[PDB]
Design goal:
alpha+beta, Heat Shock Protein 90, eight-stranded mixed sheet, binds chloride ion, binds magnesium ion, Heat shock protein HSP 90-alpha, chaperone, Hsp90
Length: 210
């Protein structure tokens, strides 16, 4: 079963704004997705202080950045708390209706697209660079799921029975044809050093075969 859902009007609005607005500083998508991974890793860290068994699905708390030039994908993987099916359907755990409203109001009062993360909807900045985003997630409380959307108003959710992840979330960006600089090692290193240099978990940038 693949289930197909409509984005709530606010999110469809937000996604169309991200896709259509001329805005050159697209590189902030990676800061926003690393930020979301850090917040998910903080959540499982906190739960484990009182219940160490929550780490039976993997003790290591880390983020991996995986470029793949053959597939035109950049994947951000973390071993944070992951999301349940209900969280995926509910705007990937975000308060995206109210966040979208506050972000629009801020843009009127002089903010710019790079401030999106302040409003709790930074995930959607993926659409600055990707034509399609796939999110694979596993929470201790639930099965592994894949969410997917190429925007256009709808997203799908389906049980994933690809390679099991112990716990956490993988964001797979299928990059736009003109945004392949974000698969280049030196470009990813530069962005991590510029915007994510104090994140409190290891960030490993994977190498590709020649
Ligand atoms: Cl909300
Ligand atoms: Mg925060």
């Amino acid at each position: 079963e693949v289930e197909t859902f409509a984005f709530q009007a606010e999110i469809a609005q937000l996604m169309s704004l991200i896709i259509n607005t001329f805005y050159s500083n697209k590189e902030i998508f990676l800061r926003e997705l690393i930020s979301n991974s850090s917040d998910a890793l903080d959540k499982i860290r906190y739960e484990s202080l009182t219940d160490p068994s929550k780490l039976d699905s993997g003790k290591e708390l880390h983020i991996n950045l995986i470029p793949n030039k053959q597939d035109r994908t950049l994947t951000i993987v973390d071993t944070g708390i992951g999301m349940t099916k209900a969280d995926l359907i509910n705007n990937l755990g975000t308060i995206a209706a109210s966040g979208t409203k506050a972000f629009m109001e801020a843009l009127q009062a002089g903010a710019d697209i790079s401030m999106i993360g302040q409003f709790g909807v930074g995930f959607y900045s993926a659409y600055l660079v990707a034509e399609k985003v796939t999110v694979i997630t596993k929470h201790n409380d639930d099965e592994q799921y894949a969410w997917e959307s190429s925007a256009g108003g709808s997203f799908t959710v389906r049980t994933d029975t690809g390679e099991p992840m112990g716990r956490g979330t993988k964001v797979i960006l299928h990059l736009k044809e003109d945004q392949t600089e974000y698969l280049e090692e030196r470009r990813i290193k530069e962005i991590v050093k510029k915007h994510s240099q104090f994140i409190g978990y290891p960030i490993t940038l994977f190498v590709e075969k020649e």
